[PDB]
Amino acid sequence: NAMNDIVASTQLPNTIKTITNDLRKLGLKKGMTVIVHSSLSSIGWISGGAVAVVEALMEVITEEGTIIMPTQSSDLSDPKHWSRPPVPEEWWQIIRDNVPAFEPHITPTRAMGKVVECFRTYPNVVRSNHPLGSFAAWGRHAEEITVNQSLSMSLGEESPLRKIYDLDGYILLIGVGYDSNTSVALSEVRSGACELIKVGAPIIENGERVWKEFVDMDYDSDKFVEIGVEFEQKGTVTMGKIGNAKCRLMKQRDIVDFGTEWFRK
Amino acid sequence: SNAMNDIVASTQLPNTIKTITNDLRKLGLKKGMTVIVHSSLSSIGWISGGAVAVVEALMEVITEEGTIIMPTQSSDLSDPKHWSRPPVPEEWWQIIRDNVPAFEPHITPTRAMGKVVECFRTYPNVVRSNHPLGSFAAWGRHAEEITVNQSLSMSLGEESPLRKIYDLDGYILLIGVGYDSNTSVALSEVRSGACELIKVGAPIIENGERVWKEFVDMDYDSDKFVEIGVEFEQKGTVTMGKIGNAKCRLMKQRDIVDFGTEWFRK
Ligand SMILES: CC(=O)SCCNC(=O)CCNC(=O)[C@H](O)C(C)(C)COP(=O)(O)OP(=O)(O)OC[C@H]1O[C@@H](n2cnc3c(N)ncnc32)[C@H](O)[C@@H]1OP(=O)(O)O
Ligand SMILES: CC(=O)SCCNC(=O)CCNC(=O)[C@H](O)C(C)(C)COP(=O)(O)OP(=O)(O)OC[C@H]1O[C@@H](n2cnc3c(N)ncnc32)[C@H](O)[C@@H]1OP(=O)(O)O
Ligand SMILES: [Mg+2]
């Protein structure tokens, strides 16, 4: 059983205070702009679960900083492309006609984790407009980062990823690897190394639910591992533990710029 | 199975807000009703929109002139001395009482309530009662009346949302779950004096700060609910129907609560 093993692998309980302290040790600082990706279970047993992680991040960064997390809702997309899992083709139009429109305060994430689910409904946390590829933010640049994401190229030059690059932010990975590192999508975009697809999603326009068509890049996270590996040789990724979780902290601009180059080749 | 491919394979055609709404109506849900809902999402079959769809479907049928209630329990705020699923080492217990974050209604997640409750409790105009372990959330006409002034001690007793639903002659809707999820029966247990009092603890915000607070509650036993529910069905009034693959029950809270009270008295 999952929980039983999480407990048996923990020597002392992780708390808001021990996470805060592990975060500072790693090098998270007041006033930093940081995009966070995490696995709650990798930390080991935490008193207060996802709430403890979110409250600890906030205590360290404070309102002078900014915390961003991906809040993707890929269950709203066109089912023609579904693979985990696929549905019968005869359902496809029914889904396009009936799936509820994206509402930022309401639509759940998928595959982002409990930390993200706690974050996005936490008070004062703001979420971008995109029906499949939204981000949530909290703190000083929250509103600047999440406003006006374009429908097409959700992870591109007019997305929260670009605004983080411009603010010279950090990426914090907590018990996950480079394949969760969203920001490298920007490298794929700038090098033009991924394929394009025609997607759709339901939005609320003029007060009415419209199924909308647009273009996005077919982001493949699997080549991100390779990039991460080579990036780590060449310089600066601070590594440390938060509880049992292996974490990394790096500058987004450095990794994005390395990834762009890596793709030209 | 909760594997998504098993959930898709168990379904002929997608469940949608529309199909669920129609299924709810056939079962007897009506406009203006007061209803407390307990659910399992996976039991319905594959739903376009998931929990969002189920919530919107409930709200469509009940409307703002009715009232929807769901339990929003947060049992991992409890004293770890009693935990069994799983227990934690005894050396962790005072660390936990000193560090576990205080209950705050707009923030504290539920546990074992289900995705539908986690979706519901985040909607706008949903009000949550003030109890660090046994809170309830409500939406619609009587939402405020039902959630206000929950007492700390005897959380599911006479000063609880369960009694307010009782006084309103409300309904209970089970979607793909059995009687051990039927919280209303705890009110029967209170009224019969058929369980022990225990000393319980939780973290609350009192006087602007986190306090590990102790209080008295009953040690509610949901294993007796299943046995009550088997009997109630041989003898009381319950409507049964299906929402997708889910077997559902709709019943009057006053009926099962009174039946349960008598049952406890033998
Ligand atoms: C490139 C892209 O854009 S991809 C999008 C980016 N994705 C992300 O940033 C997400 C990154 N995270 C990951 O990828 C992670 O591996 C995940 C989220 C996919 C899965 O990680 P998990 O540890 O299994 O899940 P999660 O973080 O949600 O935590 C849930 C688990 O925590 C465990 N848990 C529950 N309570 C506690 C507690 N108090 N303490 C510790 N663990 C707990 C439980 O096992 C729970 O399991 P459940 O799913 O059965 O309820
Ligand atoms: C007496 C008392 O007070 S007890 C407190 C009251 N308790 C309650 O009211 C709880 C009632 N519900 C239960 O008892 C249920 O059995 C639960 C919630 C414990 C478990 O039921 P589940 O169906 O497994 O969970 P839930 O309702 O959260 O739905 C999540 C599952 O839906 C499935 N799912 C995901 N998307 C969809 C979709 N679009 N369509 C259908 N199913 C989906 C997945 O299997 C997901 O499981 P996963 O998180 O393991 O991957
Ligand atoms: Mg809210």
TrEMBL record, chain A:
Keywords: Acyltransferase, Antibiotic resistance, Transferase. The keyword Transferase applies. Pfam families: Antibiotic_NAT. The gene is aacC7. It catalyses: a 2-deoxystreptamine antibiotic + acetyl-CoA = an N(3)-acetyl-2-deoxystreptamine antibiotic + CoA + H(+). GO terms for molecular function: aminoglycoside 3-N-acetyltransferase activity. The lineage of its organism: Bacteria, Bacillati, Bacillota, Bacilli, Bacillales. Belongs to the antibiotic N-acetyltransferase family. Cytosine binds at W82, S83, R84, P85. This is Aminoglycoside N(3)-acetyltransferase. One of its GO terms (biological process) is response to antibiotic. The keyword Transferase applies. It is an enzyme of class 2 (transferase). It comes from the Bacteria. Its EC number is 2.3.1.-. Acetyl-CoA binds at H37, S38, S39, L40, S41, I46, Q72, A111, K114, S180, T182.
